[PDB]
Paper text:
The linker region blocks the active sites of these caspases, while the N-terminal regions of the partially processed caspase-3 and caspase-7 bind the [name] domain in a peptide-binding groove that accommodates the four N-­terminal residues. As has been reported previously for other [name] domains, the overall architecture of the [name] domain is a three-stranded antiparallel β-sheet surrounded by five α-helices, with a structurally important zinc residue coordinated by Cys200, Cys203, His220 and Cys227.
Therefore, the structures of [name] [name] with five different peptides soaked in and bound to the Smac binding groove were also solved: ATAA, AVPI, SVPI, AIAV and [name]. The methionine at P2 shows how the side chains of Asn209 and Lys208 can flank and provide a hydrophobic environment for a longer P2 side chain. Owing to the large arginine at P3, there must be a compensatory shift in the peptide backbone in order to allow the side chain room to fit, since the Cα—Cβ bond of the arginine lies flat against the protein (as was noted for ATAA).
Residue numbers in the entry:
A (entry chain A): 151 to 234
B (entry chain B): 1 to 4
Write the structure that this text describes.
Amino acid sequence: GTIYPRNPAMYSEEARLKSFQNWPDYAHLTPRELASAGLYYTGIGDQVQCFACGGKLKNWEPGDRAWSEHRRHFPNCFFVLGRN
Amino acid sequence: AMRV
Ligand SMILES: [Zn+2]
């Protein structure tokens, strides 16, 4: 159809969750919260990627939420625009 | 967070 995920593999929330196997211990956000926001781990530092838009984010900050960082950086993401 |  008319939209297409940048990474079809990470379409599943479960698969996004498992990508956080080696999420570093200084990274305060939970794999649960990140995966639920469409994000999976790139395997580099604290850098994550959206399956849908392909946007990438790093250097998470105390008080950051995955959804709001996702939305504010990539507002036109179909995953962002499809949630509730 | 910031863009890469
Ligand atoms: Zn996105």
